[PDB]
Structure formats: structure tokens, C-alpha cells
Amino acid sequence: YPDEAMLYAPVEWHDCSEGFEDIRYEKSTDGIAKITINRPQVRNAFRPLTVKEMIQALADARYDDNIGVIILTGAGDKAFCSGGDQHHLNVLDFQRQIRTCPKPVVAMVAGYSIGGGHVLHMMCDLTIAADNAIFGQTGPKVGSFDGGWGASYMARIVGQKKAREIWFLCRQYDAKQALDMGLVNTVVPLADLEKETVRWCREMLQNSPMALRCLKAALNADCDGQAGLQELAGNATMLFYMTEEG
Amino acid sequence: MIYPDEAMLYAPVEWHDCSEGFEDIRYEKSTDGIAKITINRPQVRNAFRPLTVKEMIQALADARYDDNIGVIILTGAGDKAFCSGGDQKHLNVLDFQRQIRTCPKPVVAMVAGYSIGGGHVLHMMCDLTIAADNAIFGQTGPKVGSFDGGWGASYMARIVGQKKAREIWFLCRQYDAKQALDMGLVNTVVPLADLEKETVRWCREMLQNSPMALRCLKAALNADCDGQAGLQELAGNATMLFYMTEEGQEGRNAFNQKRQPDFSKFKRNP
Amino acid sequence: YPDEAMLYAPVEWHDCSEGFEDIRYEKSTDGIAKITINRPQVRNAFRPLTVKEMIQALADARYDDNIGVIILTGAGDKAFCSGGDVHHLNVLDFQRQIRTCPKPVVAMVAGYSIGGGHVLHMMCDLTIAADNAIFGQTGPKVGSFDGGWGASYMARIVGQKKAREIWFLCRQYDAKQALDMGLVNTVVPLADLEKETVRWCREMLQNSPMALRCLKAALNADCDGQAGLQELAGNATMLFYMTEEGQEGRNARQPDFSKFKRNP
Amino acid sequence: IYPDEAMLYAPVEWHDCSEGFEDIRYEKSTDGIAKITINRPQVRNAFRPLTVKEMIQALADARYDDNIGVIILTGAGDKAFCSGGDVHHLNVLDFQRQIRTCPKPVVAMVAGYSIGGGHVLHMMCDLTIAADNAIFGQTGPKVGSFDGGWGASYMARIVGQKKAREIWFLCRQYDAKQALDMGLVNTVVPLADLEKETVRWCREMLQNSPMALRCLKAALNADCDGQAGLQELAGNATMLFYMTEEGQEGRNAFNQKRQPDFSKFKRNP
Amino acid sequence: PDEAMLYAPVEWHDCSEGFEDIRYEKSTDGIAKITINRPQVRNAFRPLTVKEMIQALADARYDDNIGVIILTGAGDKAFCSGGDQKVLNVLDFQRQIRTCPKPVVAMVAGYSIGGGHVLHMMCDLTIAADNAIFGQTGPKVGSFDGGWGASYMARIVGQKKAREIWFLCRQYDAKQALDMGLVNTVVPLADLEKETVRWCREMLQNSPMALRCLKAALNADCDGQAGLQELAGNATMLFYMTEEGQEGRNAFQPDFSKFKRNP
Amino acid sequence: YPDEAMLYAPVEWHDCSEGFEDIRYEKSTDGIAKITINRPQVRNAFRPLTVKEMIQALADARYDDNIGVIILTGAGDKAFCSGGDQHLNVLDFQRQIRTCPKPVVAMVAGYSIGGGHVLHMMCDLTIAADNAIFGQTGPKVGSFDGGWGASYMARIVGQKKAREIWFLCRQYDAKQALDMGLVNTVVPLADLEKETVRWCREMLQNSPMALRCLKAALNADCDGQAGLQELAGNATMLFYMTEEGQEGRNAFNQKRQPDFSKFKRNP
């Protein structure tokens, strides 16, 4: 395993936010890309423009051979993303893009991850929660619902009883509650959120990118039927090209 | 995000009896929209016989069709048993399972004491389960010459995961309220004396939310399990919603106005 | 195999229609129940009352131990069911009821099977079509859709390309076209329609009702996820009750399964 | 009330939108058909990564053009629709997903060869109109490749498992009549009438409810694509919900800092 | 490709030592042939027969010189009339055919009935003689196959035809089978093996790894996680054949820093 | 319920290892077969031979009508199995565990790692000692199990935990495994076999037929048509044991038309 010294080393961030109004986008030299929703004034809720930019940034990250892991997070300590405002439903494109991204996407959550913003963290492969993080859906209370990955995939995370509770009542849940039901991967003190997140990112960066790619697709394949097969078979095709028989 | 005040949530509940004709169950309705179906055979720990199931089906259909009802509670009479299983002394409980599954309103298992065997599958079928601290859970099939290999198995695995589902079925042990909570088999555990109080609160929290959103989400979550049957529910709600829009009304309007439908006038979205 | 003489024997229908406004309900002595949409003045389109009645009639046939097969059909020779005319969308209840009926259900189709009425014939296990039969959807032409079994299950019948064509264009298809894409099981001259349908019913009636029941559930199981497992496993449970091992557990004192073999 | 032969077969006024594209042509008709044409007849319309990038760009434009209701995918000339692959090496997988999730009917108009990667492309299209000189088949196992995604599973949902295994394992070529008989294409027409017939089919769809077509396409995908299909279908449901008074009461209440009153709305059976 | 190659004579070698109920042969060009040899009972299988077929198929799977397997019946009157009623390991045989990483071809002359019909369906391809007869018998003789015999049949012929075949238990001739997509082709009885060998050789000309991956992928549309196990297993195998995958065993701390992180 | 005294009675293991080199194989009188990987020197990693022998032993247990439950374990107290020895016949063994009609219990002491971790997951139940360690290693050593090692892992611990396990390849102690539902129970190392045997005896007291139908039904939630083959296969077996099923057999045997008209048509 990597040593705590390298895992907890300072990070060399370079800004790549040119042209974005709603988000910051940064890359570290050791292979991490970070997308930060930058609207703390509205608790980092997204509007169609925000989504358009996030899609832009993620495509760039996917296409950058130096980038191995992506972080999705919100500006400040009070919110990851408090929901959608509140082309229209372009966040559905973003969900699919996170899903099919052949690199791990890690949600770094401080404060509220709510509504459309809660589905976004669920869509990420992993979630690192600050001890101040708050989670929940709001659909039925505000005249919406996410019945796609927001529902079924939530069930594959926390189980059907809990998923029905989360959606039907629309309560809020603190970090411990989220951890207890398997909704997040770990809870760390707010001060160490990014520190610990970078560590998790670095642990993955030390591993085979091809293996990670294949495993993400295999795990998607337990959910996404033929769409999941397209991903998994796609990687097999890519591997076949790299061999002699190929 | 304004939530309901606790004063409202914990206000007294008024049940009105609608049990006329039932022998094995009680059926009651609150004026604020909860329907409560109670297995009423406390002397046999609320075990169900075919008659009990017929009556619960009848009551659940009523609750479904009553536009004043938004949520249903399923429970057992007394403090000792939600339902101890099938009366051992035909298999129409399979129909009741489907009926709970496809009910467009949330169904809540309110569990005191034993939820066992067929009665355990019943609480699992309900969307949520509120358990009293004296609640006991488990299957009995392999110990009594039976099994539920339908939703009793697969769906249980979607609740507690595959390792725990195999343990529950293979050994047929009993589990206390803390055990069930820990594995995610129930949603919360509350003091026995507060069982109905907290259950009603949960119901009222749902009653404040969109009925349409709730039926859509219920269908969507069933859709993760029930293949094309799930698609039928989810798509049927989509159809219902479509009928509530101008485009979804043009066909009926055209027919009424004796003209061909015209979809040229509607905007295409991305 | 059964003798053609017996298969094509005359059939004597007994009326059980008492109390129905929109349908006829009849039973044969040899175990066929026939449900007939009786609204020729509207090409046998169904309204919510029609559906409630068909649900009632099908529930009766399910519980009648004398009935082994159900026929669904439309009155007259011009329409099986032309479409929709408890509650507004109760046809969804009826679809599920046909699906989970442990007895084979056969659509007997003369003339139009269209829209909601086309999904109905698809739901039936088999379809015997008259040479004048006409099939198709109408949803997108009249601002509606059936995205449930009306879409996915159709695709399991005719394949994805054909399913998309049927729904997206909403054309009508003759009996030959329907047969060519596997949408119906056979096409017979209009005069022979009930004759050939009764033969098919009698062929199934000669077979094991338990085997048919299990196979219907098994075939549904390829489509309906856990709902399908509920049906298939439920039949397994019923079978288990009929065995000595099942009955021992139920008689047991601590049960004693030791006297039972742990087969491979 | 049906189309009308005169309208269906009327002339089509195409407008060029190919500015900037190297490998494809892109055109739109005034009545709502967008046509993406692979423009590489010199190599039997095989695609290279740039070709795929451009098709992605064009398809996204059509998706977002509220004037467009149907998309035609085709190859330049009469000899090939697409003969396979040679911006990254496997970006055709992106294009596959984009056709899949496009809320508008996509029609493959096939003249001549639809082979290999190009065969999977026509399969992904909702419908396929084939000219009588059309030839279909896979080549992977012969050329050190395979499409085990929708190229396999989805093919089986079209032609059945026996035929799908045959097509892939032997890599033969099939003529239009063979393809028609196995359910692989929707119709076969004379080469000279290919666009004429295709446009008719497009026009027949253009007469229908765009929302209904959208929901049905997602419903049909949903029989194949698991949760990804649920995402499409449920997404359409959410979109419709926003258009209802009940949905709107939820939004209004939240924006006015008040509890919503959904009680004014029935709890249907 | 090349008619003279495809229809060239076939050189068979016997490998039947020890078998009572079957013959097992291997050609010099990489085809294995398992022949049910009980023509006096229309090639119905008894438990012994299934045991031997499992043995033979396991051998064929593990023989690197074999690229395609033919399953057939002795004589011209019967592929397999089903389970010997005079007497359930056939479920093991089904799984083995399913998970065989090489194409399995059913060469059908005469009856393929009941259990014997499920067998041809399980094979990847079916070449039928014009004298072939297909159908199920379960509901007529107190049985059913509700596993691959039901669901997978539906993935071949569609749900209407599947329900008809099972519910009525009629027999279907070669043209009927072809018309519903139940078999891949129908040929004159005298040319059955000739054409079957051609199809086999056409497959033998293609990549065995690609065929293996495609079979798993097509199974994966049906077999849930069991299908994923097959498909992902092939991907794991392919991975081992790459530099990145080798960086493990070549080390035996591994260093993946060098490898691109592709889109 | 079974008596505590009976459940905790001493075990009488009878050896059946004859002809094996990498494993021990033993049967108890009361119906438990135990397969032990016997390569303590290499933390009980498997080589192709080990797998071939485990396949042989598992097949024997399946066919032995005296056996109702199988235990899979590793020699000593330091490792259950640390994975592949540094083929893919282990894939056949996974399927063999999956389709075994008898419950299979992983009795885990110390390391269950890599290929050895998938093996415990494949078992119906896992009894873990307080010294057990779990984790995958694929991405760290240039491999992956994208089959049941992935999808089925998600059906146990949920999708978030499954991705964490695979992507980082950390090690997890027994408490962590329990909390995530990866194992069924954790017991003091000293009582590992005592407790494992109790769980086995608890199962042995139950209907073998009900157990195999339920194992198939639970597999069926994961394995599509392959799972339908298992579940339906059991239904057919049950059917054969009924008068109705048997009539069809007799009728065909006695060269006469079957008469099913004498059997009830249930709702």
C-alpha cells in the first residue's frame, strides 16, 4: 500500500476554469480533476447553465490522459448541491455522463446534498462525507421526482425499505445516519474533508486504470441491462485490440 | 423547505369504523386520510386464514378507491403480534401480495410483537415498516414444510442484502427489533406505547406530500425489481400524466370537436 | 394426439351473462369459458364498465375448477375490440389479471383489434386470427400510449424493429402481415374462426393443467422480474405442499426430515 | 384519418447545414426531417473517429432543433450506408448511446452495404428502410473485433437468439430479402425510391404526437436497458409532471416559502 | 471462404472408448462430434447417456485442437426424442452447453422432441434436415421445462410461438421451424453433415477468442449475473494478455503510472 | 427450535482426503462436509490443482445424500484463502458453489483476500472469526473479477461499498465486514468451528427441499434465465412427485392417452 506520507502530501492544483460562470474546474499534476459548483449564495443549487458547464468539464476530464479520478464538490462548507433551480432537464445528460465515465468519480460532500443534488452524489462512484453533511430528497414535497437512477440506484445503495422512506417522507439525514445505511463511504471531520478525499483519490490512482474502468462497467452492468453490457463489452473490445489475436 | 410542525403530526387521530361485514379484521379510516387494516385474531397471534386474506383484499381495494384515503396502515390487533403467519390448522395471500405491491398509495406495516412466516413477508411487502421495541421478525418455511420463493426471497434480498436473506431463510431464527433495524429490515424502532403515535406521524408526513409524486416513485422503485410488470406501473403513471397535459388532451378534444387531431401545434423538446 | 373428430366436435355454450351490461359470458361443458365484448354499435370499444365486467367474468373463470381455458373475443365479425371508449385506467388491472391467470387465455380475433384492444389480444397467451382481422396501435395518432406490456411485451413477440414501427407509425396490418411477424399464432377463414379456436382450446384441455400453469408462469418469468418469480415460485410452493416432505414439516413435535433424501 | 398519399410523397425541400463538416453532410427539410449523411463514398462510407465526432455534433443539433421531429441516418451514394470503422478510437460507442437516448425517431436509410460497425449503426436506429440492393452483416470475428454490447444483445432482440448467433459466428452477408424475412429491417423498396419511401415513413411519424413517440421510444428501450432505460422513461414522466397543476403547486409553494396544498388534488386509484 | 475448402472431405477419428450410449469423434480440422447412439429408442437419453455426453463435452471444451462441437443423433430418424421414460442430470448438461466457450451446433435429422428439443435449442445454431420434426411434450406426459426450455425458447421464436409450442405440444416440420426462426437453415437429408461441416468450417476460419466473447455477450442478454460472469471472465482473460495486466505478475511494487488513462 | 446442547455437541469428523494433495476433505456423522484448503505456508492461496480438488470434493458432497451442508475453510488460524497463487478454472468452481443445492458456508479465520474473497462471497453464508481480514486486490496486482465478484458483491454490501472495496483494494477487519453485511456473524477465533457447526446443525434440522428451492429463488434474483433454470428445475422435480405428474409418465409408459381430467384446476 502507498505510505501515509505520499497520500497526505500537498496537492499541486492548476486552475482550468476559463469561460465558466457557474463552476470552477481544477486539475492536479498527479491526476485528479475537481469540478466545484460555485454558487454558494444559493447553496450550490444548479441551473441549466451550471449543468452545461459541468458536462463540459467532465468531458474534458474524461478525455485528459493525465486525469485518473474526478472529484465533484460544492464551493464552501455549507453545501455540496441543494438541488436543481426551481435546456431544461439536461441534468439527465449529466447523470449518464457520470455513469459512463471510465474513471472513478468521487463526491466530496460538505453540508447539504439535497434533491437533484442528492442524486448527483449517489451517481458518483464514491461519496466522502464531512461530519456536517446533510442528505435527503425533496421531490414529493416540491412537485418533482427522480424515478430513474434517483430511485432504482438509490435502492441498490441503501435497500428498498430505506429508499422508500427517503423518497416518500423527504426528511433530512445527518452524516452518521447516511453512513449507517451505506449511503456514503466514510465520514470525516469537516476540516479534513478534502485532505481525506485526496487520499482516497490517490489510493485509486496507484491502481490499474484499466482494471478500475472494467470494474466500474461491471458494477454498472448489474443495473443498466444492455446499456451496462455496452460498457462492459466495450472494454473487452478495447482489451482485445491490445492483444495478439486482436 | 418548510416541514410539518410536530403539533400537527402528533395531534390525536380519530378512527371511524368501516368494518361492517368483516369477521377476521377491522377496517377503519381517519378523517385526515389514513386507512387502517387490522388483523383481528389476537387469540391465535393474528395468524391469517383464507377468510382473513379475502377480507384484507376487500379492504385494501376500498382504500385504493377511496379518494379521501392517501395512506394505508397494516397491523395486528393488540400488542403481541402483527401476524404470526398462515393459520396452520388457499394460497390467496399471493393475490394480497400483488395488491399491496401495485397499490398507488403508500402502505405502512405497523409492527408490534411477532411478524413471522407469511406475516413476515407481509410486512416486507409494505413500503415502510414501523416497529415497536417488542417486535420479533423471521421466516419459518424450512422448519414447517413451506417456502416463499417469490417476493419473500428476492425482495427480501433487495432489503437486507443476499447474505442476510440467505441466513434468514436457511436457519429460520427470530430477530429482535434492534437486529431488524441494524440490517435495514425495518425503517425505525419506537417504544411500544408510542407505536401508533409515531406511525401516524410518518403517515401524516407522507400525506403532506404529492400523491402523484408518491405513486410515481413507488412504481419506479417497484420497476427496479418487477421487470415488465414494473414497467406497466411506471408507464401507466406516465400515461395518466400525459392525459393531464394539453398535448395529451388533443386527441379527446379533436374527437369532441369532430376534427382530426393536430400535433403540429405542439413544441418538440430536446 | 387427440382425434380430429373430437377436436372439431360441436360445442354447446351455456350462458352465464346474467347481470352484465357490456359483455356476454358463456361456458362450455368441456371446460371453455368465453368472454365476449358485446358493443357492436361501437366496434366493441371498451369503457371502464366493460373492463370491470371482464374482470369479474375472468375472476369467475379462474375460480371455476371446471374451466381450463378462457376465450376472449368481440361480438360479431367486424371487431375484436377497437380500443378504449370502475375507474379511468382500470384496463391496467385487467391486463395484470390476464397475465397472472393460471389458465391459458386465447384471443379470438375477427376484424379490428386496435389500440387498447390490440394490447388486449397481445396480453392473451395465444391469438387465433380470422383472415379479415386487422391489427395496430393508435396511441401517437390520438395523443396516448401504452408504455407497459403494450411496448416491452410487444417487443418480445415481434422483435424491436417491428415494435417500433407498429407504435411510431400506427399503421394497420392485415392477418397475413400479423402472421408473418409472429404477432398471431395462426390465420383461418372467418367462417372457421370459432371452429379452429375451440380445437386449439381442446388440445390444451387434454394436457396437464398443472404443467400449463407452471409454463405460463415460467414464460412470464422471462419478462416480469420478481413479479414473475412470485408466480413461478408460488407454483413451486403449491407443488411442495403436495409432497411428503412438505407434509411432514407441516405435521411436526420437532419435524423430522431425516427420512427424506438430499438429492443431487 | 390517415396520412394522404399526395402529402406523403410530395417533394422535399432540403436545406444544407454542412458548414464545417469534413466527413458528413447535414441537411434539414422545412417539414421537420434532419438528414445526416456519411460522405465518404470513396471508402464505402466507412467511418473514422472524425466522422463519428461530426455525426455526434449533427445529431445533437437535430435533438435541440425544435423544428426537427425525425432524423435520417444514411450514406452518400447508392453503394454503401456504412461499411464499418477504420475524437478517440472507440467514440462510435458514444454515438450508439446518443442514437439510443435521442427522444426523436432515428431512421436508417440503407442503400448497398451496411457492414460491421456500420451494421450495428443501422440496428441502433429505431427503424431501417432498406433499398433492394442492401447487404447486411457483421465482420468482427473475421477482422479481429467484436461488438458484444448492443451489437449483440440488441441484435438478439430484433432477430432472435438463433439468428443473432449465426450472424456473428459466421459473418456471412445477407441480402435485403433475407434481412426483411428475419425482422432485421422494416421494409425493402426499389433503390430509385429509397429516399421517397423513407421520407414518407418520416412524414407519417411527423403527423403523430412527439411526446407519445418520445415516451414509447423510452418504454421500448426500457425493456433492454435496465435502470438506464428507467432513467429515460421516468425522465419523461417527470417532464410531464412539471406540466400538471399538481406539479406546479409543489414548485409555487416552495418559492413562496409556504407549505404546499396538494389536498386540492385527487388521490386516484 | 472458398467452396472447395468448405465441402472438402472430412477425416473423423474415433474417441468413443468407454461409452455405452454415445459416439464421440474428432476431425483433423478441429470439429468434435457427440452422437447419441440409441437409435432403437429414437435416441432418447437415460441418465447414463447424459453422464457420457457431459464427459464428452467436457473433453471437447478442454481440447485446444477443437474449435466447434456438433451434437447429433445416430441414424436419420431422430436427433433426440427426449428423456427415456422407461427410467435430472440433463440440467447439468444444459448449463455445460450454455457455458461452453466454443460454438455448439445441433445437427438435426428426424425427431428433436421434448427434452431432446430443449437440447437443440440450447445449441448456438441448428442445422435441420428436411425430414426434421420439432416440438415439446411436457404437458402431455406430466413434465415441463420452465428454465431455458421456456424463457430461452421465447428469445428464439417470440412469446406467442413459445406459448403455442408449450401449451399445445404439437409437432412442427422443418419449414415451420425455419419460418419461426427455430432453426438456422434446412437442407436435404443427404447433405445434412456436408452442410453442417461447412458451417462449422466457416466458424473455424474466424477468431476463436472473438467467438467466445460474442457467445458470452449473447448469453449475457439472458443469464443476468451468470452471463456477466462469462463475459467479464473473458475480459479478465484478455486483460492478462496486455502489458498493463502483465505489470502485475511481472512485479512478483507494481507501477501503473506509465499507462494511459484513456477516454 | 434445536436444543443448545445438541447444537454445541462435539463434532465427529471422519476423513475423506485420500488422493488429495492441496486440500483436506472430511464428513461428520450428522451431515456436514468440510473442504479445507491445506496450504498454510502460502496463506492458503489456490493453484490450479487446489481448484481441481475443491471441485472434486464439492461434487462428492453434492452427490452424497448423507450430506446436507458444506463448509469451505482454510487450514490453521491465519488464512481462509489469500487468492490465486503467484488457469481460470476457479470460474467453474464459482458456478459449482452457486448451483449447489445444499447450503455452503465459508468459515473464515484470518485472510480472505482477492480470489479468496470472492470465494467466501460465493458461499451462502459466512461465519467470520474476530481475526478475519477481507478485501480485493485486483486493481493493485493487475486483475479484476467483473462477474459475481462485482455484481453479486453489490447485492451483498450495496453499490457504494462495492465500488469502494474494488476501487481502493483496502483491507477490512471483521467488525467492518459485519457492519456492511459482508459476513453473517463474527465470533471469537477460539469458537469459530463450534459456532459454524451450530449454524450448520440449525440448517440440517430444516427441510432440505425447502432450502434448495430458496437457494434457487435467491439466485434467481441475480442470475436471469440461469436462475430460472435452477428454480424451475426444482419445480419440475416437485411435479414429478405428484399424482398428476406421475399420471403422464404412466400413460406414456402404458401406451395410452393421459387422463388429466381427473385432477383439480386450482385458482
Swiss-Prot record, chain A:
UniProt feature coiled coil, ranges: none
Similarity section: Belongs to the enoyl-CoA hydratase/isomerase family. MenB subfamily.
Chain sites annotated for binding substrate: 43, 82-86, 112-116, 138, 144, 241
Cofactor list: hydrogencarbonate
Gene: menB
CDD domains assigned: crotonase-like (cd06558)
InterPro entries (alphabetical): ClpP/crotonase-like_dom_sf, DHNA-CoA_synthase_MenB, Enoyl-CoA_hyd/isom_CS, Enoyl-CoA_hydra/iso, Enoyl-CoA_hydra_C
Keyword Lyase: yes
Name of this protein: 1,4-dihydroxy-2-naphthoyl-CoA synthase
Catalytic reactions of this protein: 2-succinylbenzoyl-CoA + H(+) = 1,4-dihydroxy-2-naphthoyl-CoA + H2O
Annotated cofactor note: The hydrogencarbonate anion plays the same catalytic role (proton acceptor) as the side-chain carboxylate group of the essential 'Asp-185' found in actinobacteria, archaea, bacteroidetes, and deltaproteobacteria.
EC number: 4.1.3.36
Subunit note: Homohexamer. Dimer of a homotrimer.
UniProt source species: Escherichia coli (strain K12)
From Swiss-Prot, chain B:
Reactions it catalyzes: 2-succinylbenzoyl-CoA + H(+) = 1,4-dihydroxy-2-naphthoyl-CoA + H2O
Documented effect of changing residue 252 to A: Strongly decreases affinity for substrate and DHNA-CoA synthase activity
Species per Swiss-Prot/TrEMBL record: Escherichia coli (strain K12)
Cofactor, how bound (note): The hydrogencarbonate anion plays the same catalytic role (proton acceptor) as the side-chain carboxylate group of the essential 'Asp-185' found in actinobacteria, archaea, bacteroidetes, and deltaproteobacteria.
PROSITE patterns linked to this entry: ENOYL_COA_HYDRATASE
Result for mutant: residue 255 to A: Strongly decreases affinity for substrate and DHNA-CoA synthase activity
Positions of hydrogencarbonate binding: 139-141
Protein family: Belongs to the enoyl-CoA hydratase/isomerase family. MenB subfamily.
Gene Ontology cellular component annotations, sorted alphabetically: cytosol
InterPro entries named in the record: ClpP/crotonase-like_dom_sf, DHNA-CoA_synthase_MenB, Enoyl-CoA_hyd/isom_CS, Enoyl-CoA_hydra/iso, Enoyl-CoA_hydra_C
Name by which UniProt lists this protein: 1,4-dihydroxy-2-naphthoyl-CoA synthase
Regulation: Inhibited by sulfite and nitrate.
Subunit note: Homohexamer. Dimer of a homotrimer.
Enzyme class: lyase
